[PDB]
């Protein structure tokens, strides 16, 4: 035989999963629930969000044209940045007031489009198969620890922890070669 | 800040403010000296999305210079309430953002033709009070 | 729309929008040739209601041309939410629908109402200055 | 309304209007001789909120005749539902005040200015 | 938002929500006055944001800024907005004597013209990196849990967390500045 | 060695559920999955025109 599951979701299923560390069971919906369905959601997005800014090689761009307006000129702070920085130097960015301001000049009046390096977010049901299962491990952890304690459940989610990083590094290792005797030859 | 204008002549633009549908979005092509040659794209022939936050042109940009983009949110109401039924969080918040969005759109818009004109009828009271008030006290 | 147009020397009136209470529509004479006299009626002894969506006259002048009609909402709750009582559907759609209106109202009346006092204050200055 | 002005030269002032949180008050010294003139203060570096009605300036006045005072709503959510959790009646009252205040404002304020400035000529 | 960022999110509410979970309760839904927690809360929020804000880093030190005096006295106001007030490459006598600019080499508070120094503003929670909001965050909590309520669970982790924080903090702070230290170096 | 191959009516490709790890066999690559389609990092665009050859993994059944 084999399992084919009934109308199958990424983020139904990685719920029930850590409702399971408690020891409760599954669900079918998530319009309506009890306080627990609503306190894994919170859990979820934030260490998500924690995770995905170190930044990997397939998240960094290192060159992205932004541009600004026509009436009055300046350049907007959308809440799905997460780092700026220039390539092959020092850099001074921040906000102040959802603009873009540059210490250096101490100024807010970019005239011309400017090239970055900048890592943006994206959904959670688009990553490989490794980081979803490093971020579900996470975030169990933490809701295990916040609202129930129990010592059986703990001392193995560490143990599967650190093989899942691991893991994540090993993988990461193989997608770059990283060559250090680039660009060296003479006779 | 729900009216963005950008120079024409690339291929991909970039959204820049929440959106509860995908089809309260319009995108149009502007001339600057002639404003009676203006035109609207339709989605599926003249543009695509990526992600929610991208798209890419599809058509000859000849003879224009500016793109524009802007939200228009409907009328009609999205939850229906009705007698003997749970009561969920989402309907609650569903009704209350389509609100607060119209109300944007609403002062965007006035504020735009209402401040020139302001402006001009407190400058043109505060000439006529200092000059013809101060003239007339010097004069007697 | 929000704001309708009537010809004077007649008898019975319709109305052209939806409202939320009786007292929010206005209904005033309009005089073409003096904008400043356009006398503004009131319920009771100069018009009344007997088809939600009819006006019925009491009283007509034949000084006047044109007749205003014209709604605006009022800044205040109609519903009422208090501990003890009950939640039915018709206050919770009732309570949204009073903003999705005010919007259209500024959206007509802001701007030529704008005209007029701008034109009225230019006016004033400059009599002011040549007197 | 939404909009008031008071005559220079005092130390505390009066706010009168509803809001719904402390930082959308905005507070303005005008010039009538002068329109260009104006500039706008910054709280904490220029005055502070003795309590809820009351605010004292720090600033020294000059060549300003007029204090202005008007209000201008966010855009941020005040109430945000989620489920299991307790519901009373200033929760559904806040979630429509904020849009109606949002309407009202920009319904008004223009207007208003505009009237006082005609008056004034 | 079920796949992406809920929309119109408030910062301070979710940090606050946030805080309350660390001693196993649900939300507040109002962020309101009358409550007794959200005024502990609010107070150990803000000054764990001003402690940490000071330390000093490569976005907050402005090499050139420009004071004033005033015309009909010669003195400089000293705002509560000022955290650190130093000299470019030099040794600097500088404090505060009654609400004003005071130079103890020259003991006086007298300033003729402007002059020019380096100092570090604050500024609002909810325009810093994320990765500082997350740990502002913990430590905040950390305190909240060992003030107010003792729970021996809920620690023995947030020590772990506090740390990874931290660590991440460095990379970002050693990556923004490149700092070569073979500059200036040449000749044949 | 495996081939992939573009749509006809327009140029893209499918990224199905079944896809486990997707690299080049001798160099650095960049591949990512976007909206159920194919995207390239390093030129910013999901307009594919040519079968391309990849290193892939698929799944089995625990049989």
Not at chain 1, 32 to 37: H, R, T
């Amino acid at each position: 035989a084999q399992y084919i599951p009934l109308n199958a979701n990424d983020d139904l299923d990685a719920i029930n999963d850590m409702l399971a560390a408690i020891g409760e069971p599954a669900v079918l919906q998530l319009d309506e629930g009890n306080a627990d369905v609503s306190n894994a959601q919170r859990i979820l997005h934030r260490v998500n969000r924690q995770v995905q800014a170190k930044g990997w090689n397939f998240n960094i761009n290192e060159a992205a044209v932004l541009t600004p307006d026509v009436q009055d000129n300046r350049i907007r702070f959308l809440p799905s940045y997460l780092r700026v920085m220039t390539a092959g130097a020092t850099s001074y960015y921040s906000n102040m007031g959802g603009y873009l301001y540059d210490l250096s000049t101490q100024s807010t009046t970019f005239t011309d489009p400017i090239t970055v390096e900048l890592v943006e977010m994206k959904p959670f049901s688009e990553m490989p198969v490794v980081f979803r299962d490093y971020i579900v491990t996470k975030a169990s952890r933490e809701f295990n620890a916040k609202f129930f304690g129990s010592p059986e459940s703990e001392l193995y989610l560490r143990e599967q922890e650190a093989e899942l990083y691991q893991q994540v590094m090993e993988y990461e290792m193989d997608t770059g070669r990283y060559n250090m005797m680039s660009d060296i030859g003479r006779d | 800040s729900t009216i963005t204008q950008f120079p024409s002549g690339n291929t991909q633009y970039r959204i820049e403010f929440d959106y509860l549908a995908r089809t309260f979005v319009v995108v149009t092509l502007v001339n600057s000296s002639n404003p009676t040659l203006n035109r609207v794209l339709e989605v599926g022939r003249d543009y695509r999305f990526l992600n929610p936050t991208m798209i890419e042109m599809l058509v000859d940009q000849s003879g224009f210079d500016i793109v524009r983009i802007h939200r228009q949110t409907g009328t009609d109401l999205v939850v229906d309430f009705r007698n003997g039924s749970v009561l969920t969080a989402s309907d609650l918040t569903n009704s209350e953002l389509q609100a607060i969005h119209i109300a944007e759109e609403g002062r965007d818009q006035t504020v735009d033709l209402a401040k020139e004109y302001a402006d001009a009828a407190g400058s043109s009271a505060g000439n006529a009070k200092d000059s013809e008030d101060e003239a007339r006290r010097i004069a007697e």
